[PDB]
A paper describes a structure:
Arginyl-tRNA-protein transferase 1 (ATE1) is a 58 kDa aminoacyl transferase that is conserved among nearly all eukaryotes. With the aid of a transfer RNA (tRNA) cofactor, ATE1 covalently adds arginine (arginylation) to its protein substrates to promote their degradation. The reaction requires arginyl-tRNAArg as the arginine donor, and ATE1 catalyzes the specific transfer of arginine to the first residue (Asp or Glu) of substrates. Here, we report two structures of ATE1 from Saccharomyces cerevisiae (scATE1) in apo form and in complex with tRNAArg.
We first determined the structure of full-length scATE1 using single-particle cryo-electron microscopy (cryoEM) to an average resolution of 3.2 Å. The structure of scATE1 displays an overall new fold with a compact conformation consisting of three domains, including a highly conserved GCN5-related N-acetyltransferases (GNAT) fold, a putative polypeptide substrate binding domain, and a unique variable domain. ScATE1 folds into a compact and globular conformation consisting of 18 well-defined β-strands along with 15 long and 9 short α-helices. DALI analysis for the rest of the structure returned no hits with a Z-score (typical range 2~60) above 4, indicating a new fold that is not represented in the PDB. Within this new fold, the N- and C- termini of scATE1 coalesce, forming a mixed β-sheet (β1-β18-β16-β17 and β2-β3-β5-β4) facing the GNAT domain. Notably, the electrostatic surface potential of the scATE1 defines a large positively charged surface area on the GNAT domain that could interact with negatively charged nucleic acid. Inspection of the cryoEM map with the modeled structure revealed density within the substrate binding domain that cannot be solely accounted for by protein sidechains. This density localizes to a highly conserved cystine cluster, comprised of C20, C23, C94 and C95, and is indicative of metal coordination. The melting temperature of scATE1 (46 °C) decreased with increasing concentrations of EDTA, suggesting that divalent metal ions are required to stabilize ATE1. Consistently, supplementing additional zinc ions further stabilized scATE1, as evidenced by an 8 °C shift in the thermal melting curve.
Residue numbers in the entry: 1 to 503
Write the structure that this text describes.
């Protein structure tokens, strides 16, 4: 094997809203922004006391997964945290969450960038050097020219292995900026050293490292050979000032975290790191730059939109610029693009093929897109009923343990305090719709999986293939269906299921 998708069975984990990483379960007097649609807000005004607002998370733990498949899932809407690959339910969560991607060519120009670049260039180079005539707009040229003629500043690229000065800088930054005191080396290794990717991507070849370090000197027309995650360190007079942790994807570069020395707040290393990453993308032959998830309301995450980008649309797998949909996404409410040509009688047919899974979509600029979120996911939304008869049909015929629920389980009440909800709700945006799944079953498309799908039993401590779909126990069928719903038929085509009833 070289690229088998080996993970655990996805499960729905719920935690109280106070543990929210951005709102902490509160946003002030704007109770509407806690919800996703105003209709549910008006519905639950009477039930504000018994509303069990949580921080919805869906995901699973990964053991081994290829970098290209990671790119596919990152374009789908997932980014991993440590070794935990997950994404939130857009509808039932507490805070909104989208993925943004940026191109190096479409950067805007502001006075702050000019000032910071000028200060950095003045600092690193010698005072006797005369600056060239290259315009400040060409930031890549400015950065390269500044780095060519400096002796006190240099950066290096190394794998993600553990060290001691890195941990010292990490704890210094923690206790100085976030007042986190219980940091431990094991916690640091878990946070920034666990790697689902294989060792080949982790350690790489020395020639690849040489090319990555010589990135300022690569002529266009060559291919960047290295793949996987890397760490970038910013030396200055022989001592560390910052650490950049990121990864190299075939379609771009993503960012996860950043640590800098507290005493060097003068240089404002965050913006400099972002600009240097953009310069790396431009000088290299990569094309995009995934900044992470995007949250609108939260003031801590708003800075990511300064560079300008396009926020992902979960229900269509398309990328659209933020400018046309600014009013649509204002105040943090879920949206789905739509046109007057097509009605909303049934759910959106998510094309479960390569043409519609984590790849770009050239939109029709003639039509004026309009919000249809309240049409398909509103009080009179047709999703709930269709889900109901679909679940009834699957349970009646194929025996999959699907069950029906009343048209109010969008936000469960205090009754779920007795039993923690572990199942994936039927009504969830950006997922495979139930009726399409029923079409897959009834058309015999499920007959493709058998012969090359692998199911691992912890009880037997062995790996077994899928021979007959219908002969499996009902729980196995439920888990397989959930995986196919969450990640896709093509993804499950070349995956390995670590299924166990021991848990
Ligand atoms: Zn929240």
């Amino acid at each position: 094997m070289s690229d088998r998708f080996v993970i655990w069975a996805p499960s729905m984990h719920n935690e109280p809203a106070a543990k929210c990483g951005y709102c902490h379960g509160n946003k002030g007097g704007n109770m509407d922004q806690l919800f996703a649609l105003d209709s549910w807000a008006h519905r639950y005004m009477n039930k504000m006391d018994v509303v069990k607002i949580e921080n919805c998370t869906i995901g699973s733990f990964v053991e081994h997964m290829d970098v290209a498949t990671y790119d596919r899932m990152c374009n789908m809407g997932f980014r991993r945290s440590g070794k935990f690959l997950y994404k939130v339910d857009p509808l039932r969560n507490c805070c909104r969450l989208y993925t943004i991607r940026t191109a190096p060519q479409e950067l805007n120009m502001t006075k702050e960038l000019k000032k910071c670049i000028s200060r950095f260039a003045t600092r690193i180079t010698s005072e006797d050097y005369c600056p060239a005539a290259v315009a400040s707009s060409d930031f890549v040229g400015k950065i390269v020219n500044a780095e060519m003629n400096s002796k006190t500043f240099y950066t290096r690229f190394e794998p993600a292995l553990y060290s001691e000065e890195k941990y010292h800088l990490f704890v210094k930054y923690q206790e100085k900026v976030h007042q986190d005191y219980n940091n431990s080396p094991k916690s640091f290794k878990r946070f920034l050293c666990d790697t689902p990717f294989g060792p080949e991507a982790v350690l790489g070849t020395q020639e690849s490292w040489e090319q990555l370090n010589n990135w300022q000197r690569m002529k266009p027309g060559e291919k960047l050979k290295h793949m996987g995650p890397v760490h970038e360190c910013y030396y200055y007079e022989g001592k560390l000032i910052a650490i950049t942790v990121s990864d190299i994807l075939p379609s771009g570069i993503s960012s996860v975290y950043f640590i800098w020395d507290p005493d060097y707040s003068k240089w404002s290393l965050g913006k400099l790191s972002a600009l240097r990453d953009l310069a790396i993308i431009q000088r290299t032959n990569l094309q995009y730059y995934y900044l992470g998830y995007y949250i609108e309301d939260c003031p801590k995450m708003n800075y990511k939109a300064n560079y300008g980008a396009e926020v992902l649309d979960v229900c269509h797998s398309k990328y659209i610029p933020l400018k046309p949909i600014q009013d649509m996404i204002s105040r943090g409410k879920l949206f789905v693009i739509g046109e007057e040509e097509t009605k909303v009688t049934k759910e959106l047919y998510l094309v479960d093929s390569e043409t519609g899974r984590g790849e770009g979509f050239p939109t029709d600029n003639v039509v004026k897109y309009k919000n249809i979120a309240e049409e398909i996911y509103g009080v009179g939304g047709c999703a709930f009923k269709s889900a109901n008869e679909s679940a009834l049909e699957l349970k009646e015929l194929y025996g999959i343990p699907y069950e029906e629920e009343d048209l109010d389980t969008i936000y469960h009440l205090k009754e779920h305090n007795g039993h923690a909800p572990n199942g994936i709700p039927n009504v969830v945006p950006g997922l495979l719709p139930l009726w399409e799944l029923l079409d897959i079953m009834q058309s015999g498309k499920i007959t493709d999986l058998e012969g090359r799908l692998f199911l691992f039993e912890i009880e037997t401590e062995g790996i077994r293939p899928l021979i007959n779909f219908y002969s499996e126990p009902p729980n196995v069928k439920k888990r397989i269906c959930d995986v196919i719903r969450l990640f896709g038929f093509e993804t499950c085509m070349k995956a390995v299921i670590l299924y166990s009833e021991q848990m």
